[PDB]
Structure 1
Amino acid sequence: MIDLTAFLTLLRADGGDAGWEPVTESGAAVFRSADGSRYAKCVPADQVAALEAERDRVSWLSTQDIPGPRVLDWRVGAAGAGLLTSTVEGIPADRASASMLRAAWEPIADAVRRLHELPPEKCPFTRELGEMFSMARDVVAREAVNPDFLPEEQRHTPPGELLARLAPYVGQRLAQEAAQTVVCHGDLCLPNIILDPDTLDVAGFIDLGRLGRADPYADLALLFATARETWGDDERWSQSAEEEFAARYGIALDRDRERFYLHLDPLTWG
C-alpha cells in the first residue's frame, strides 16, 4: 500500500495549499501540484537513499547545460522522503502521435547526443553494467520481476532463465561499455522525454534517477523499443527509423548489443 497520508504530510508541510494529488510503484508515489507546475516523488524509509540519489542527479544535471527539472525541495521524516521538482513543460513523447514523434525524431537524436557528450569521467554517477547486472540478480532472487515489463515473447518464461541468457555475455558487454561509455539518462523510454508542443523539439528530460555512466545502448535500446510502439503498422518507417536516428546521432547500429540492454532492463526493476 502507498503511504499516502505520510507522503501528503511531507508535501503539505509548508502550508502552500498546493493541491498535491497522486498521478502514479514499489511503495513510491508521484504527485503533481494542482497548478501543474511542480511534481513530487515520495518514497518510504527504506528507499530514501535511492531518492537522494535521484535528487543529486537532477541537481547535478542542472549544472551541465542539459534541459531537465530543477530541485525545489527535499523533505525527510520518519516515514520516508519527498523530492519536489519543477515540471518540465510539454508533452511526454509517448503521448505524441506518430507524425509528431517523427517531427521530434532528429531533435531527440540531437538532444540525446548532447547528453551523451558530457565527459563521462567527470560524471559523479554511474549505472554501469556490473551494478545493473547485480541489481537484476537481486530482483530475480526476490522473484520481483514484473512480467508486464518484459518483451511479449518472454512474459511466460521464468525470469531466472531470462537472466541466465544474458549472464555469459557480461564480460563482452563490459568490454564494449569500457570502449564506448557515455553519460546515460538511464531510463530513456519515451515517457521520459518531454517535447515542446509547438516546435516539437525536446523541452527536457525527466525521471533521472538512473543517470550515469553506461554504454549508450543502455539508453538507445529503450528509446528505440518504445518508439516502435508508436510507429505501429507503418512498416516502411518502422524498418528505417533506427538507421536514420543512428545516422543523425552518430553511431553504428549493433543489434546484439542493443538487444542485450533491451532484455536486461526489465529484470532490474522491482
Structure 2
Amino acid sequence: AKMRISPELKKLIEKYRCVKDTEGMSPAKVYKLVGENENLYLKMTDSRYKGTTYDVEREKDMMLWLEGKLPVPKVLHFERHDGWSNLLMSEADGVLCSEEYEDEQSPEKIIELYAECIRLFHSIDISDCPYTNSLDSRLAELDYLLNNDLADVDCENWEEDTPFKDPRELYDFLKTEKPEEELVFSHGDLGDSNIFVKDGKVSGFIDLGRSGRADKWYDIAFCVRSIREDIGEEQYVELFFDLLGIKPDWEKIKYYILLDELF
C-alpha cells in the first residue's frame, strides 16, 4: 500500500542488496544497491525540498543534461512518488577523491585535481543549461529554508566566535553584500566526497542538485575551503591559483564560503 518507492522501482531494485550510506550531511537519502553484476545508487528527497537545490529531481535534470559533457552517473530511473523524488543511477567510475588521498598525502595531486575541475567546467557550454543558480535564486531559496526551519543544522553557528548572531543576520549580509556575477557551469558543492579520480584524472562527478549556471568564484572558493581544511598548508592555495593562472579575489571567495554556511 503506502510506500516511498513505486512498485515499478521496487521491481527494478529487487535483485539488489541494500546498504544505507553512512555519512549524513544532507536531507537526501542515499542507498548503495549491491548486485551480482554491478552496484546502483538510489537517492531520495522528501516533499519539503521540492524546487530547492537539494531536490533530487533537479539533480536528475542536471545529471541528464551533463551526459556527454562531464563524466557523471547514468540515470536509470526517476520518479515522483507520494511526495518523494527518487533517483536510481549507475555507480560513478573511478576512486572517490577522499579515498585516493586519505592518509597517503599527495598535496600537489589534489590541487591539480581541483584545478582540472575548474578548467573542465569553464569549457562547458551553458547556452541550454536547465538551471540558473544566480545569487538571487540561491537567496530566495535560503529565505524559504530559513522560514521553514530547513536550513543546515546549526552546530557551529552556536559558538560565541560566530561573526553573525543568527542565520537571518548572515542572510541579510549575503543579501546586501551580493557581488556581481559571471555565469559559468558550476558544480555547486565541489569537494572530496563528490569527485572521483582514475589514473590521476577526474573520472566522475556526483551530488548534482546544486549544479547549473553560477559565478565562477563559487566553485573556486569551495576548492580553497577544501584545500585549507583537508590538506592544511596555505602554500597549496597558492599553487592552486598558480595552476589556474589567475589572482584570487578574496572578497568574492569569502562571500561564497559564507553563502554555504547555511546549506
User: Are positions 1:190 and 2:192 aligned together?
Assistant: yes
Residue number among 168, 179, 198 corresponding to 2:176 in the alignment: 168
Q: Identify which range, 141-150 or 48-57, moves more after superposition.
A: 141-150
- Rate the CA distance shift 1:77–1:164 in 2: closer, same or farther, 3 A: closer
Task: Name 1:21's counterpart in structure 2.
Answer: 19
1:22, 1:239 → 2: CA distance?
A: 36
2:93, 2:157 → 1: CA distance?
A: 30
On the 8 A contact 1:46/1:80 being kept in 2, the answer is no
On the 8 A contact 1:243/1:253 being kept in 2, the answer is no
Q: How many residues align?
A: 251
Residue number among 240, 243, 250 corresponding to 2:238 in the alignment: 243
On the 8 A contact 1:104/1:195 being kept in 2, the answer is no
Give the aligned residue type for 2:237.
E
On the 8 A contact 2:113/2:201 being kept in 1, the answer is yes
2:208, 2:93 → 1: CA distance?
A: 16
Task: Name 2:229's counterpart in structure 1.
Answer: 229
1:204, 1:90 → 2: CA distance?
A: 7
5+ long unaligned stretches in structure 2:
none
Task: Name 2:61's counterpart in structure 1.
Answer: 56
- Rate the CA distance shift 1:37–1:100 in 2: closer, same or farther, 3 A: farther
Task: Name 1:203's counterpart in structure 2.
Answer: 203
On the 8 A contact 1:23/1:31 being kept in 2, the answer is yes
Quote the RMSD (CA, aligned, Å).
2.8
Query: 1:243 aligns to what SS in structure 2?
Result: helix
1:189, 1:103 → 2: CA distance?
A: 14
Task: Name 1:67's counterpart in structure 2.
Answer: 71
Shift of 1:94: 3.0
Give the aligned residue type for 2:77.
D
1:124, 1:167 → 2: CA distance?
A: 24
Provide the TM-score with structure 2 as the length reference.
Answer: 0.83
Provide the TM-score with structure 1 as the length reference.
Answer: 0.81
On the 8 A contact 1:149/1:266 being kept in 2, the answer is no
On the 8 A contact 1:47/1:80 being kept in 2, the answer is no
